């Protein structure tokens, strides 16, 4: 039946494609042409519609496609843009859950993680070959992403930017397949140049390529490598930035058989190079990750936990920590008698001194071509290859020697966190988009106003991973409706993992050990 595609597709063309993939193709072709007209985009490539009608996927997508022949092989790099359609329902999957002696099945919709199967990709490749004529071409996966059903398609600015970013990545991957030279400390280490860095206690969120908010408590900014006394580059003005890492810190309530009860879980939510640089490679990513390490290694992250004193509406007010402590009460942090010293004491008794470094990993994110190696490095059939790629990336940064710090085959680079991440946003009182991750441990304690039993039910939902994830997802959504509100939109899900402490030691020390010295701007607190 599915093998009749061999007859169905032999000749001719048809009238088809869903309403969103149709509209999306039309706007993306318009944007391509305007970008060429303004000379922002080069006219060396093609945009294609992938149909659920003409070919074998549940979800249609547009394909950002670039090509070159590399050493005789035709190579195509594709960055799919999934187009979910609110009016189209793909048949659901049966989730059978063996609840001890009780067996029950939950049916559920396929998300981009379930949709982007290995065959989904292979079908994308085949269609491109039909559309490009390159039937013997190899196709590079730049990472599928999704442009969600919900918003109006008239945002030409964002859509233009999506094409720009997607072609950037396509050029990188053709280049890196072509053998292009890597990013390294040697390029930064001018004989007359040094690095410096600071922690930004932002007070604001940051936004992905489609404009959705990303939680961050601290933005780590690594300054441009340079030195006073160097030749000024004519009449210029520039931001002195090299890269940045977005992160936040939760306070996880963790077991112990003497440590205090909460863990300073430092979570990377995003990794970006400064906007003036176009390329996106593993070496650039890996180098930037050292920015999160310094958050607790040299500086002190705990300043981010200070309550917004004077602000009534602080949903994550530290005062909530008193509900997990022996007080079983909110600390009065509204008062003129609440001091910096009292804050430090709450933490002395409640929060552990040893930082833990972890990060999100998203196969469908803005950095998916790279996120995918870090995800496969967690485990599975190609873990060894993904790990080899990552250690090679750091060695490219330092000129070898990562191996002088530890054995990557005894110490895999990233461990699973188990509980995965539901992403989404909610609207605040003025209708702005805010990250749903705000109901973190302090957030949830204030949301239940001290009802510890309600908190613990939620907390167990977010921690006990012997419970099938569908059951956990349903309870997590039930809790958002009661505590966050009904104005909640869900977005593409993501993985989380723990960076191996030895990977971290080797990355940070190896860079410092080759002389790429970085000064702290916050010289003392």
């Amino acid at each position: 039946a599915g093998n009749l595609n061999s007859i169905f597709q032999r000749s001719g063309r048809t009238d088809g494609g869903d309403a969103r993939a149709s509209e999306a193709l039309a706007v993306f072709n318009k944007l391509k042409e305007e970008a060429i007209a303004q000379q922002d985009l080069h006219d060396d490539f093609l945009v294609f519609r992938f149909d659920r009608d003409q070919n074998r996927v549940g979800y249609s997508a547009l394909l950002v496609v670039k090509r070159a022949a590399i050493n005789g092989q035709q190579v195509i790099v594709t960055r799919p843009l999934v187009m979910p359609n609110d009016q189209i329902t793909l048949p659901t999957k049966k989730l059978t859950i063996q609840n001890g002696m009780h067996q029950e099945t939950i049916e559920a919709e396929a998300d981009v993680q379930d949709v982007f199967t290995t065959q989904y990709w292979n079908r994308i490749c085949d269609s491109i070959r039909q559309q490009t004529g390159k039937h013997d071409a190899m196709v590079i996966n730049a990472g599928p992403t999704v442009i969600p059903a919900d918003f109006d398609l008239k945002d030409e600015l964002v859509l233009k930017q999506l094409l720009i970013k997607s072609v950037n990545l396509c050029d990188d991957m053709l280049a890196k397949r072509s053998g292009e030279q890597p990013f390294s400390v040697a390029m930064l280490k001018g004989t007359d140049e040094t690095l410096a860095a600071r922690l930004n206690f932002t007070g604001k969120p940051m936004h992905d390529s489609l404009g959705y908010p990303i939680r961050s408590d601290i933005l780590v900014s690594l300054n441009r490598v340079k030195k006073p006394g160097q030749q000024e580059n004519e009449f210029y003005e520039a931001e002195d930035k090299l890269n940045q890492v977005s992160c936040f810190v939760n306070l996880e309530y963790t077991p112990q058989p003497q440590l205090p009860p909460l863990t300073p879980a430092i979570v990377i939510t995003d990794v970006r190079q400064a906007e003036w640089l176009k390329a996106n490679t593993m070496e650039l990513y890996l180098f930037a990750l050292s920015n999160a390490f310094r958050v607790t290694a040299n500086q002190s992250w705990a300043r981010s936990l200070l309550p917004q004193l004077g602000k009534v509406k602080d949903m994550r007010d530290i005062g909530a920590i008193g509900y997990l402590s022996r007080l079983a009460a909110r600390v009065e942090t509204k008062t003129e008698t609440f001091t910096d010293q009292n804050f430090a004491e709450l933490l002395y008794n409640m929060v552990r001194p040893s930082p833990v470094f972890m990060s999100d990993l998203n196969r469908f994110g803005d950095n998916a071509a790279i996120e995918n190696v870090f995800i496969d490095a967690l485990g599975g059939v190609n873990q060894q290859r993904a790990v080899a790629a990552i250690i090679a990336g750091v060695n490219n940064l330092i000129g070898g020697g990562f191996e002088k710090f530890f054995d990557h085959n005894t110490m895999p680079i990233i461990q699973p966190y188990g509980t995965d991440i539901q992403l989404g946003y909610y609207l605040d009182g003025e209708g702005e988009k805010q990250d749903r991750r705000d109901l973190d441990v302090l957030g949830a304690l204030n949301a239940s106003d001290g009802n510890i039993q309600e908190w613990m039910s939620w907390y167990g939902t977010q921690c006990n991973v012997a419970v099938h994830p569908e059951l956990r997802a349903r309870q997590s959504k039930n809790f958002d409706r009661q505590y966050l509100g009904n104005s909640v939109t869900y977005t593409t899900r993501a993985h989380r993992g723990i960076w191996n402490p030895k990977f971290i030691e080797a990355l940070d020390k190896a860079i410092a050990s080759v002389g790429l010295t970085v000064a702290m701007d916050n010289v003392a607190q």
Binding site: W121, N122, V373, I375, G380, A386
Partner: peptide, 12 residues
């Protein structure tokens, strides 16, 4: 508990 792998490329 298990890790699925999609069709990644370039690095392998």
């Amino acid at each position: 508990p298990q890790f699925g792998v999609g069709q990644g490329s370039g690095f392998y």
